[PDB]
């Protein structure tokens, strides 16, 4: 069968309730219970029974229409029908409140924390990438400083190599 | 008798002539030895003079200066090998010892006024080498005039 | 004549002796002053 | 704004029973003062109901042929007095007071108390749940406002020096740790200048020694040369010029 | 033997005349020897003072001592002109007299 | 409310039933034609007039049933349960949104404060307390001096070596020249004052370091 | 029987379904009472219209009470049946259906994972500051290295200019100059020794 | 007979002449053996005596009391000194610093012996005072010779420079082999080398400390060539084996 709307189900079952109620209130039972007055004028008893039935049925219809009016029942039921028809794919029971707000809110607030973690990871990765180049520059500078110090030491040793010749000359020009 | 006296006289005359001519030959021998000694003295002195002249000629040739003695007790110095156009140009000056036992220059070639400027200094210092070096320098300067 | 010549020679030798005697005290006192100064 | 609750409709008046034909029956209890004991109030109300019934029946059957109305009133008064005595006796024996005692119908109750216990458990659980919800809301809002206020007080120029332990977890920890000294190099530069100056002094001394050396050598050469010259000169006369000039 | 003694007397007086001629020849030889002796003295006296003193004056002026036993055309010797004596080693076969004299005089000290 | 406050329904019903025959006793004097109907109508009237002024457990007689249910407590408990259901449902629907908004605000504030974190690391100050510029200039001047001196020394020393060699050569030909015959011939040869003056007075080499005064004229 | 809280249905509709069911009950019973009372008033006024009404109000009220009890029982049964119909069909939310507001609750998230995520976020926050401080220290090190290199270059050009100055005054190489000077000094010492020996020999002889 | 007697007298006179000439030669030889003292006596007189110390740069003039008239026969050892004079003949304008230092020190000693005006009154104590002075003179001259030697051969011992201020003496040692350069200041006195020298060190370059210098100084004996020995020991201890690195 097709998916029947909730408001139409409500209307049909209310009408069925009215029908079985008026069936329960039969005219023969009505006159049996009111046999005292019925012995005087059965006809006016018949029209007053008909008036009772019509008035009660009209009152029930007015009540259901009214309650649908202020309760906003039709729109809510239609929205619920849309929700159930869009989500009919799921067969397993749907999630329900756990009773503890923390685990209920964990699902809500997880994705944004995940996004923040991802952004922070990107930032720290970029900083590490920059720091790698910085460390490479530090190493190059250290190597250059070492080389310059070695060159200075070479100049110092080249200038200090004159000592052997100077001492040889002193040996040549010896004291008496 | 008389003949005996005559023969005795001739015998006396004999040995007197013999003795006198013998001493003549003795003096001849002495004269020969004297002339030999004189000749060998001449030869020795001549050889010594030749050696001295060789030395003096070497000095004069190498230095160019010529030192000679002339009358009036003057010592003449001749400088050559100075003027490049002719090295034989004689640049002469005469030095002589005066009465006061002092050297003094007599003249020059040509008439140069730098006569005394060296003679007082050579009188005092008695340095002939520097004296003549200065004289040669003065002559060289005179040449280029 | 010989006696006179010998007398003249003796006089000259005596004068030389006097000169040398005068010149002796020079070095004698010289040396003994060096002795006194050195000790 | 408007959404119906069950409490919102309890205040609304309902009618669970038919209105009686008779009027003023409710005022019978109003006419009875509450100063009397509740048993006496019951007796007075029952007597008032009896008189009301008598006075209602008095004119209802007047149309019937023959109606002993005077004897009806006489018997009504006599039976009202007797009924007042009867109510007093029922008050004395205590059975009239039994209307103020409740029975024990537990046979129909036990399920109802079970349901009430379930409701009590549910409402307690839900009260704890809403309390926890309110606590979470206040915690989060207070955290947010505290962070915002602290940030507002922040954003000034608060320079913070970095302690070495901050670099302990750094990726380039080895590079930072292996940093060479740099002032020692600057001191070694001055040391190098000092040693160059010392070498310079040595060079000057060597040059001075060499200078004195060849100076001494030249002096020795000149002395030996003049000695040789004098040795050569010693043979000659003091002045060849005088001897040469004096020749005649 | 009057005549014999007379003829012998003539012979020996003749012998006297020849030996007297020999004596006068000896006397002229004596004059000859005296003149050579005076010539020797005059020569030697002139030569030695003159030559020796001229050479010594040359050397004093030049302060140069020659090597006489060297090969010809080869200036060799010692110059005392400079403060330190230096050996003169020239070659006249390749150098002019002008240059040689100028160089030798250059080495002489001109200071008074 | 002046109505009688009762608690028992069964007791009121049974005591009214017991009081019933007191009203029923009136029927003896009623005529036979109207004995039962009028009497039963009066009995019903009495029951109605005595029942409408009875309140059971704080409720009306017809509203409170025969059972002993605590009607007021049941009603208030049910109302409380429904109200707490509605309240907790509204809380579940509403609170997560505000929670998420506060979380977003806190996250953004934390991101901003992390961005604004500025660490400062001043490099260590390297000291130049000895400035070697005058030292370098002095070293350059001295090095120039000694370079000049060494150049002069290397230029002068060979000259002195040559002069010494020439002088030694002079010394070695001096005797052989002196042996030459030509050379040999050419170069053939008051107050009493004890003075107390000794001999051996000469210009000693130490006079170089001890110049005497020239009488200070 | 256990009473269903129906918290999820109440969260959807905004009200407990039992509330609206009982309000419908009270409205229906009130309307039934009103119409039946109106019919009773009509029948009593009709009885009052006819003369000598033998139908007493008590009798008609008893009949109406009986007929009211008739409807009351039948209405109670049928109304209970239709309330169960509502609670099973209309007001019931299928267990496989989730509200749009709960769309974020479709995927579960364990508390342990959330705690791990919080710890990871805190650790990353620490690491960011650590890397920033490291970068600052590295910049300081680069500046210090630049300063040191400048000083080293100054010293090296000082040596270069010193060597150029030495070269400009003849001696472009000190070592070879010293070696040549030593050799020449030895030669001159030999010459001086020879000269002294010859001079001494001339002095003695 | 008279001629023979005169000839005998002449022979005796000639023998006496030869004897006194031989005595003269012996006396002159004894002088030449003993002419090797520190002081030189240029002039003596009956009133004044003159001594010249080292290389005639110092004059010692002794002035005696006038000889008593009529008594020249008294002992020469009893002559009274009236004025003792010291003078310096050094040309300070061209004198090297060593010469000036020597003269300064010896005149410092003279002023220390200012009492010599009253101590030396007779000729007995003159030779003793002469020895006392001459010893110090010899020591000071030896010190000056050491100074000149070190000014000549200083760089052989790494002693680059010597500066002569007042009695302080600054020895500048420098050597790049040990990276040590310092100036040692020595307080010289007229009592050199017997009196230890109060040295001080200024460390221009290197870590050379006072203790090493003091130990080296105490090691060197207090005798002649003290300064030269100190220089040699310093070079040996600090630079002898250090310079061996080639």
Residue numbers in the entry:
A (entry chain P): 29 to 204
B (entry chain G): 80 to 224
C (entry chain Z): 183 to 221
D (entry chain D): 93 to 340
E (entry chain F): 86 to 197
F (entry chain N): 35 to 223, 250 to 277
G (entry chain M): 1 to 205
H (entry chain K): 2097 to 2342
Any passages from the paper?
The outer kinetochore is made up of the central and evolutionarily conserved ten-subunit KMN network complex, comprising the MIS12 (Mis12, Dsn1, Nsl1, Pmf1), NDC80 (Ndc80, Nuf2, Spc24, Spc25) and KNL1 (Knl1, ZWINT) complexes as well as auxiliary microtubule-associated components, such as the SKA complex, that vary between species.
We subjected the reconstituted KMN network to cryo-EM analysis and obtained a 3.0-Å-resolution reconstruction of the KMN network junction (KMNJunction) containing complete MIS12C, Spc24–Spc25 and all folded domains of KNL1C. The only components that we did not observe at high resolution were the Ndc80 and Nuf2 proteins, which seem to be flexibly connected to Spc24–Spc25 at the tetramerization junction. The Spc24–Spc25RWD and Knl1RWD domains are rigidly docked onto the top of the MIS12C stalk, and their interactions with MIS12C are further stabilized by extensive peptide interactions with the C termini of the MIS12C subunits Dsn1 and Nsl1. Overall, Nsl1 uses two highly conserved motifs at its C terminus to bind to the Knl1–ZWINT complex: a YPLR motif binds to Knl1RWD-N, and a VLKRK motif binds across the Knl1–ZWINT coiled coil. In our reconstruction, MIS12CHead-2 directly contacts MIS12CHead-1, resulting in an auto-inhibited MIS12C state.
